[PDB]
Amino acid sequence: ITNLCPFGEVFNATRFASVYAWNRKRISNCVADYSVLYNSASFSTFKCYGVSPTKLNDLCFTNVYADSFVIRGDEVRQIAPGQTGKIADYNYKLPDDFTGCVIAWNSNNLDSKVGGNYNYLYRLFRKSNLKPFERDISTEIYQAGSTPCNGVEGFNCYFPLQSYGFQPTNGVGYQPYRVVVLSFELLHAPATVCGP
Amino acid sequence: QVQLVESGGGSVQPGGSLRLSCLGSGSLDYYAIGWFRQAPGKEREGVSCIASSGDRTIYADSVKGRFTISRDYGKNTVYLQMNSLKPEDTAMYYCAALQGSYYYTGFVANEYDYWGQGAPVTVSS
Ligand SMILES: *[C@@H]1O[C@H](CO)[C@@H](O)[C@H](O)[C@H]1NC(C)=O
């Protein structure tokens, strides 16, 4: 295997997914240069669980999932095992036993617009918390009250998604961040993804 | 997953020096450490930052050649050496830790996860 892992495609994608509709890219049968990601000044978040970031090029995995999406600066801390909040509860949930790295960086100059970028959505209402790696892309009117909605928006009958309104003059806590979550899978099978 | 304990504050006259200390409960090896300062009324301001790699540092324009940041990995502490002190330096000083890429530095308070209790600095006109 002399296929150099297409991390460029994940990290430098012109378009990123909404967090409710988070994108998963399967990385298989490939060589991973993690060192060019970690040994840089690019990433304000680079947190690994069950593994060390200096050692990543020494490691072999069955497969690697790369999940990616945009959220607010203030929400990046919710992309971790054991976190609560709208994002962890209703949008993207890591399992307690997560093995992988959460990588984020400020995308203000790409994902903010004067007058606001409303492209990026998050789910604001849901009857219950997501299971780890559950993807809910439904847009059913959320019944807040005791009267049923029957698809009519009204009082206590809400569209369940809301837009971030990314403006380049927002406080950095409210500025967009691109997030990439790398899951390292190990099971009784040939490890397909390995450092150089 | 770390706590920061500061020490080294105090009063001084203009041209005096102070040495701040940020001691980590857990390993600070993976963390960049930032020093922010807060004066009553004024906005919080990033003073200095050192990357996890210990060989990238940034400084606010007004403190270049006055303040030096350093870290001892062995002693798991970060230091702000504060020389040539001036009344404008009067503030509460806080160290903070973030976990970014090896060379990452910044003054974005929201990107920092852990904050020290804060050390007092008074420069007496
Ligand atoms: C993304 O693009 C930048 C700028 O051209 C490049 O330096 C960087 O290595 C790319 N990142 C990856 C992971 O390929």
Author numbering:
A (entry chain AAA): 332 to 527
B (entry chain BBB): 1 to 125
What does the paper say about this structure?
The severe acute respiratory syndrome coronavirus 2 (SARS‐CoV‐2) as causative agent of the disease expresses a surface spike glycoprotein (spike), which consists of two subunits S1 and S2 (Wrapp et al, 2020b; Zhu et al, 2020). For viral infection, the receptor‐binding domain (RBD), located within S1 interacts with the angiotensin‐converting enzyme 2 (ACE2) expressed on human epithelial cells of the respiratory tract (Tai et al, 2020; Wrapp et al, 2020b; Yan et al, 2020). Promising alternatives to conventional antibodies (IgGs) are single‐domain antibodies (nanobodies, Nbs) derived from the heavy‐chain antibodies of camelids.
The RBD:NM1226 complex structure was solved at a resolution of 2.3 Å. Major contacts of NM1226 to RBD are established by residues of the CDR3 (LNM122695, QNM122696, GNM122697, SNM122698, YNM122699, YNM1226100, YNM1226100a, VNM1226100e, NNM1226100g, ENM1226100h, YNM1226100i, DNM1226101) and CDR1 (YNM122630). Beside a salt‐bridge (DNM1226101 to RRBD408 and KRBD378), various hydrogen bonds were found at contact sites. In total, the interface of NM1226 buries an area of 698 Å2. Although its epitope does not overlap with the binding site of ACE2, our structural data suggest that binding of NM1226 prohibits ACE2 recruitment by steric collision, which would explain its neutralizing effect. In contrast, NM1226 binds only the “up” conformation on RBD. Moreover, NM1226 seems to be more robust against mutations within the RBD:ACE2 interface.
